[PDB]
């Protein structure tokens, strides 16, 4: 009935295979520091470890599959805090215009640690655009990621 899904499960998984560059598959001060640092710098370590304990229910000091899924599945209809998605956007739009460009992204995607020529992205942004502007805006960004 649903055993043939594993679609969402596979999605998170890929996120762990992409975020975890070591091979353990867990969000830790290490994978967090490295990335977060290459995204917005990293102040101290004690603060990062304390921030992870304020959420780690068990105490492994890290996060696995159930805990991650739980971090998202565990929710409160409480007023939508788009501030999250919003912030995520700002990261993508580094400069400060609001829309994504071929060069802009290429810089953010290339810094993640992989190799994506200019063609791929170009084809990605294109499909993302249904009207015919050429660049991605907030409406298309929400209309595409929002699905329910």
């Amino acid at each position: 009935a649903d055993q043939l899904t594993e679609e969402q499960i596979a999605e998170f998984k890929e996120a762990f295979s992409l975020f975890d560059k070591d091979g353990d598959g867990t969000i830790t001060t290490k994978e967090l520091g490295t990335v977060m640092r290459s995204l917005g710098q990293n102040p101290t370590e004690a603060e990062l470890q304390d921030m992870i304990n304020e959420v780690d229910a068990d105490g492994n000091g890290t996060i696995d599959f159930p805990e991650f899924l739980t971090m998202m599945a565990r929710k409160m209809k409480d007023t939508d805090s788009e501030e999250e998605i919003r912030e995520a956007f700002r990261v993508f739009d580094k400069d400060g215009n609001g829309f994504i460009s071929a060069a802009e992204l290429r810089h953010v995607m290339t810094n993640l640690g992989e190799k994506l020529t200019d063609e791929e992205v170009d084809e990605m942004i294109r499909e993302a655009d249904i009207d015919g502007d050429g660049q991605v805006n907030y409406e298309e960004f929400v209309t595409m990621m929002t699905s329910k």
């Binding site: 999605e11 917005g40 993508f92 990605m124 990621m145």
Partner: peptide, 26 residues
């Protein structure tokens, strides 16, 4: 394929760990 999701979600994990800090106002 062209899923800005794994890319977004991923950043969502870290971005969330940055905001989890319940306002260090004090």
């Amino acid at each position: 394929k062209r899923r800005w999701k794994k890319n977004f979600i991923a950043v969502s994990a870290a971005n969330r760990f940055k905001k989890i800090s319940s306002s260090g106002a004090l």
